[PDB]
Amino acid sequence: HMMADLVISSYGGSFQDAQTKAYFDPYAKASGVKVTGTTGTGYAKVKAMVESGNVTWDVISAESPAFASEVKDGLLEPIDYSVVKADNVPENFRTKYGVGYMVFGTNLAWNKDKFPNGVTPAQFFDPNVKGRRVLPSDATYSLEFALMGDGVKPADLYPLDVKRALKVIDRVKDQVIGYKGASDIQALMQQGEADIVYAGTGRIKNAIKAGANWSYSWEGALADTEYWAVPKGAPHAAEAMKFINFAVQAEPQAELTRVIAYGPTNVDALRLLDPAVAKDLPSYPANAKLGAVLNSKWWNDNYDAVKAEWTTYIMQ
Numbered sequence: 001h002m003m004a005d006l007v008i009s010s011y012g013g014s015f016q017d018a019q020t021k022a023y024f025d026p027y028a029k030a031s032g033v034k035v036t037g038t039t040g041t042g043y044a045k046v047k048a049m050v051e052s053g054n055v056t057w058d059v060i061s062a063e064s065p066a067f068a069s070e071v072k073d074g075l076l077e078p079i080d081y082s083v084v085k086a087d088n089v090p091e092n093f094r095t096k097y098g099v100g101y102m103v104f105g106t107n108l109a110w111n112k113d114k115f116p117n118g119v120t121p122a123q124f125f126d127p128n129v130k131g132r133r134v135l136p137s138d139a140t141y142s143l144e145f146a147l148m149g150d151g152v153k154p155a156d157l158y159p160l161d162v163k164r165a166l167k168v169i170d171r172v173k174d175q176v177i178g179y180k181g182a183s184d185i186q187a188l189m190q191q192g193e194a195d196i197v198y199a200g201t202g203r204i205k206n207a208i209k210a211g212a213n214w215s216y217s218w219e220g221a222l223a224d225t226e227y228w229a230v231p232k233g234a235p236h237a238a239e240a241m242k243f244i245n246f247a248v249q250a251e252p253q254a255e256l257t258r259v260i261a262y263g264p265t266n267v268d269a270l271r272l273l274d275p276a277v278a279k280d281l282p283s284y285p286a287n288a289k290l291g292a293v294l295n296s297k298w299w300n301d302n303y304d305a306v307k308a309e310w311t312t313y314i315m316q
């Protein structure tokens, strides 16, 4: 049994606040287990922890390119499907080393006072459009936005033309104030320290709810899948499977979407929600046609080479 906290690593800020309300606190109440949310999730951190042999994280939230790299390096425990019992979660989300629990869009957002007529992906990469820009911390999401912004059709994205994408970012690189994580981006929006960003739909909508006079579009947006995974050598690997089972059920999945504008993988969650929530999701036909879906197969094969270039690229 659990004699200490079940440690869950995520992204912090409003998204972790949402996960705590929908998954962490309800599981703690249902199981009697102490659940502690932490930050730092990512492939580099998971690798360092697992390879050290000093594993302090029991459950991780992994975005599909980070998840792909973790699987490739044998950093995760296989999911116990005798424990994770969710026939209403499509089999393609129920993978060997992780369970797809959320579908999320990454969108172009603008401050309405600086840009009342909005910003298109073409205008984001236009040197003549003046404004403090924030791009994501890694090459993932960033490269696809640069390419769609430069006129690459969403259907023609992969294999990513990395050279072109970087030459595209090069046009507005002097106006890019940072390459930040989701929590840092939401704080910059709320503090009015940026004018144009590329961030998670839920982070944008939560900043607006909190008073940020910002807007966004689905033009050049990138949709991705978020996974629950268990680091290899996790001290509470068996309890982690019990948390994952709980979290992927219709009620916790619907509670997540209620608080933050990210979509469920459980097919029975949306009928529990306001019909209007469907319009703020990447799968919505009017939204889907304007952007693309991240290809994790491409990132699985190309992440290491792209990362080696990206690190040197953002270090000027």
Ligand SMILES: O=C(O)[C@@H]1C=CC(=O)N1C[C@@H](O)[C@@H](O)[C@H](O)[C@H](O)CO
Pocket: 011, 015, 062, 063, 104, 106, 136, 137, 138, 140, 141, 180, 181, 182, 183, 199, 200, 202, 203, 226
């Ligand atoms: O935390 C969020 O609201 C969103 C929703 C899931 C997710 O992975 N998020 C983070 C990404 O949008 C992004 O911040 C990413 O981790 C970095 O760009 C590093 O690749």
